Amino acid sequence: VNQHLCGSHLVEALYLVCGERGFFP
Amino acid sequence: VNQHLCGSHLVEALYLVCGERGFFP
Amino acid sequence: GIVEQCCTSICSLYQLENYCN
Amino acid sequence: GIVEQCCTSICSLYQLENYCN
């Protein structure tokens, strides 16, 4: 189990937790 | 960009958002 | 289940967090 | 940055959410 969030997995972690807010990138 | 969370990526999405709480699995 | 909701489809933070504990 | 904190190391929900917006 990888607990690192790199690349496309970081982007998604951010599409997930950032919701209505959006995120840069 | 994949917005699906399947397999090891679901497990991690849950290690991330569930924090102190834990999760089954 | 969590697989239909979050893998087959797209789920929100709120939905996923309801699978915690 | 977000790469050192979340990729090279492990970050929390609270840490990641501070990269939002």
Curated annotation (Swiss-Prot), chains C, D:
Provide the coiled-coil residue spans.
none
Residue pairs linked by disulfide bridges in the UniProt entry:
6-11
Q: What is this protein called?
A: Insulin A chain
Q: Which species does this protein come from?
A: Homo sapiens
